[PDB]
């Protein structure tokens, strides 16, 4: 039979059968209970709208993501999300399909063990396998080397790989991602008068960020230009009218990636953690990693980031090496495409964690040889 | 309207990419010209050496 | 609809142009690589002649 | 049929059919298992890369030479190296070709006996013969007398020969060679800030030694000059950029040959063990040995050694004798060229150790008349 390549993510759940080009169903991972009282009788009001249904009734819900930073903080809601994904968005019972979840690097063990225990006890799948979210993004590019920066919505991690041999001592995981950029944008919009507070209006600020923000090639020059002319002010129409005008908030929101001091984080930007991740590698594979830097994940879709990052790394790196940044147009679904490719391989067909193996060793089987 | 906004954003992205590519190719051409200049200089020095070696 | 068609056409042309520019820069980068190999080889040969002459 | 003139060496395996000018395939003798984990599936990752393949993937391997000082310390790896040499670099099955190995003087017997046992049982050659590495280097020079100093990469030995009669009581074998010079160079580079530790970076230090180091004609004058001017500082570009500048480390690394007290060895340099080897010979053949001093082996390729050695010996020797140092340009492959010449001789064709002879007397046949 065919395998189910699910990809929990944090912000958008992407799923679909193995062997295709794009995920079949992509929908936000939010579960929102209603918060008001409700007076109409017999309206058929449910107790929790999940997935894309709660992005249409969000006016009277309190949306809450079940995955904070890679890790899962609310297991009941995550189980609800998985149940919805299997039964309503794909309509395939899990009793007859292997599953291939994905997990960020350096995550707590208990999260992974609970994930496999749920998949084997509640949904009762035949066999499931958990894979690191960066190796798949490297599969999708058709490479076999390269250092991949997978800046998702929950957590940004940077896994270097050479000739198929991952370097476990050079993984640099940073917890700045799209959600923190949304919060920072929502916080700097208040400098013009627009106040978004409700958890429903966070979605509106996310839409503003997606449609308007861009990464500046040079920050100081843009700050000077936006403060003199008015060629940058782009307007946007809220879900009820009252258009708003975003000035130099456009390139200040995604600039947080390269200067995490804006949101008070100590660490260095995504332009310098990649160079540090390279320098921890051996001295003889640094040229190949320099030449095959891969971008993935949703947050790396800002217009103009593949040039800013290349300029920064070229500034840091030695002058002789060639710096090349692979930015495929299908960046958002790169991890899932790689997952489909991996699940479609014949050599991989015996790596699944078969159910009888789980019955013999318990949920701690995932840390064992079947990784 | 959604389609028009998508197309406009695509156009802006492609234009910026073409600008960057043009600047980069010009810079690399300048670098190649400089290295060719160095090679020609040392080649002329060696040609003078060969002219003297004709008397050697 | 008319404006969407116009914008899509211009964006497609921009994509084609950036593809052409990326191919051109690939070609010129390869040419610079070849010339860098040329300089490496000529400097190596000059060093070989130097060590042979100093070492008889 | 044609004979296979293999030459194990220590650092570079040189092989080729008898009767040519240069070895057909020359490649480092290193076998490196991968050391990291490896995440790509189906990449076709082998368990051990040998020969010149492991000098390209050395970034993720742990290279280890199977021959320490002439002697062989790891027989499985040496068997692997031989198998590679026969099947992939020459592509001739050994069942139809005699072999002519080479061995340093004064080596343990068990090494030679195991070598012949392997060649006769595993590879199943028709007939093999083991020859001393210095007599071949004397063949290649076209002489018949002379004292040859064969400073390889494993061990430096100094065999005097007169009129074809070797003098077994005058062989002076010293264990300082190219590898110790590489280690000493790697140890003195730390005085400027460059630290090379990994077994892969030993190859980089070896390349530095080959391309930059030279032997000073007079040591104290060079030490004084390099400490005042800066006309010696030559720069070199690492495999990733960050050029380095070698100062008076240039002529201090190969100076260890003439003053083995630098690496703590007690014995006298290669300039004085040759004179001692001569003085042990009879009083009537010392003039001929003085006039026909032969250099061979890789490590004697330093620019300016054929003058330093001549100056030193002229200082030691009596003033009347003429001191001449033969330094052919084809020094590195001198032993193999001599091996080809010896294997191509008709008079030598009945000295091979035929397989039936080995079957009758066991591996101890090599010490017998068929030397
Ligand atoms: N076109 C876009 N431009 C800018 N940001 C985007 C775009 N699309 C998605 N994002 C950001 O990326 C996030 C989605 O990232 P995604 O790759 O789905 O995360 P995950 O790894 O959990 O799947 C969204 O929250 C949004 O903030
Ligand atoms: N051109 C060179 N200049 C200086 N040293 C060299 C040069 N070529 C080789 N060497 C040294 O000699 C060694 C190779 O010696 P070689 O004669 O191959 O040993 P073997 O007797 O085992 O074959 C290398 O390890 C290197 O350190
Ligand atoms: Mg992701
Ligand atoms: Mg030798």
mmCIF file of N, CA, C and O in Angstrom, chain A residues 34 38 40 76 99 105 126 145 180-181 186 241 289 320 333 336:
data_model
loop_
_atom_site.group_PDB
_atom_site.id
_atom_site.type_symbol
_atom_site.label_atom_id
_atom_site.label_comp_id
_atom_site.label_asym_id
_atom_site.label_seq_id
_atom_site.Cartn_x
_atom_site.Cartn_y
_atom_site.Cartn_z
ATOM 1 N N UNK A 34 -15.222 27.922 21.307
ATOM 2 C CA UNK A 34 -15.984 29.170 21.346
ATOM 3 C C UNK A 34 -15.892 29.791 22.722
ATOM 4 O O UNK A 34 -15.711 29.090 23.721
ATOM 5 N N UNK A 38 -23.893 31.959 23.340
ATOM 6 C CA UNK A 38 -24.645 31.227 22.343
ATOM 7 C C UNK A 38 -26.112 31.109 22.691
ATOM 8 O O UNK A 38 -26.464 30.442 23.667
ATOM 9 N N UNK A 40 -28.860 30.907 19.984
ATOM 10 C CA UNK A 40 -29.653 30.134 19.044
ATOM 11 C C UNK A 40 -29.623 28.664 19.431
ATOM 12 O O UNK A 40 -28.564 28.099 19.703
ATOM 13 N N UNK A 76 -3.801 16.630 24.075
ATOM 14 C CA UNK A 76 -5.166 16.371 23.639
ATOM 15 C C UNK A 76 -5.483 17.115 22.343
ATOM 16 O O UNK A 76 -6.058 16.537 21.413
ATOM 17 N N UNK A 99 2.969 5.680 8.361
ATOM 18 C CA UNK A 99 3.050 7.125 8.556
ATOM 19 C C UNK A 99 4.502 7.525 8.741
ATOM 20 O O UNK A 99 5.297 6.744 9.267
ATOM 21 N N UNK A 105 15.282 18.955 15.117
ATOM 22 C CA UNK A 105 16.441 18.423 15.838
ATOM 23 C C UNK A 105 16.472 18.912 17.273
ATOM 24 O O UNK A 105 15.913 19.957 17.608
ATOM 25 N N UNK A 126 -0.038 0.751 11.027
ATOM 26 C CA UNK A 126 0.813 -0.441 10.911
ATOM 27 C C UNK A 126 2.262 -0.188 11.282
ATOM 28 O O UNK A 126 2.878 -1.040 11.933
ATOM 29 N N UNK A 145 25.060 16.691 -0.236
ATOM 30 C CA UNK A 145 25.834 17.446 0.737
ATOM 31 C C UNK A 145 25.118 18.753 1.019
ATOM 32 O O UNK A 145 23.973 18.941 0.605
ATOM 33 N N UNK A 180 7.658 34.515 16.345
ATOM 34 C CA UNK A 180 8.230 35.670 17.010
ATOM 35 C C UNK A 180 8.236 36.882 16.092
ATOM 36 O O UNK A 180 8.075 38.009 16.560
ATOM 37 N N UNK A 181 8.407 36.672 14.793
ATOM 38 C CA UNK A 181 8.314 37.800 13.873
ATOM 39 C C UNK A 181 6.900 38.350 13.824
ATOM 40 O O UNK A 181 6.710 39.565 13.735
ATOM 41 N N UNK A 186 3.382 42.755 15.329
ATOM 42 C CA UNK A 186 2.204 43.217 16.054
ATOM 43 C C UNK A 186 2.592 44.228 17.116
ATOM 44 O O UNK A 186 1.780 45.075 17.506
ATOM 45 N N UNK A 241 -12.456 47.047 6.220
ATOM 46 C CA UNK A 241 -12.275 48.385 5.701
ATOM 47 C C UNK A 241 -11.095 49.046 6.374
ATOM 48 O O UNK A 241 -10.116 48.371 6.698
ATOM 49 N N UNK A 289 30.354 22.883 1.769
ATOM 50 C CA UNK A 289 29.250 23.473 2.509
ATOM 51 C C UNK A 289 29.042 24.927 2.120
ATOM 52 O O UNK A 289 27.905 25.397 2.029
ATOM 53 N N UNK A 320 38.194 33.803 -0.927
ATOM 54 C CA UNK A 320 38.406 32.919 -2.065
ATOM 55 C C UNK A 320 37.221 31.989 -2.306
ATOM 56 O O UNK A 320 36.879 31.721 -3.460
ATOM 57 N N UNK A 333 7.058 23.841 0.799
ATOM 58 C CA UNK A 333 6.785 22.412 0.880
ATOM 59 C C UNK A 333 8.023 21.570 0.651
ATOM 60 O O UNK A 333 7.898 20.384 0.346
ATOM 61 N N UNK A 336 8.165 18.535 2.918
ATOM 62 C CA UNK A 336 7.230 17.477 2.586
ATOM 63 C C UNK A 336 7.572 16.780 1.283
ATOM 64 O O UNK A 336 7.373 15.565 1.166
#
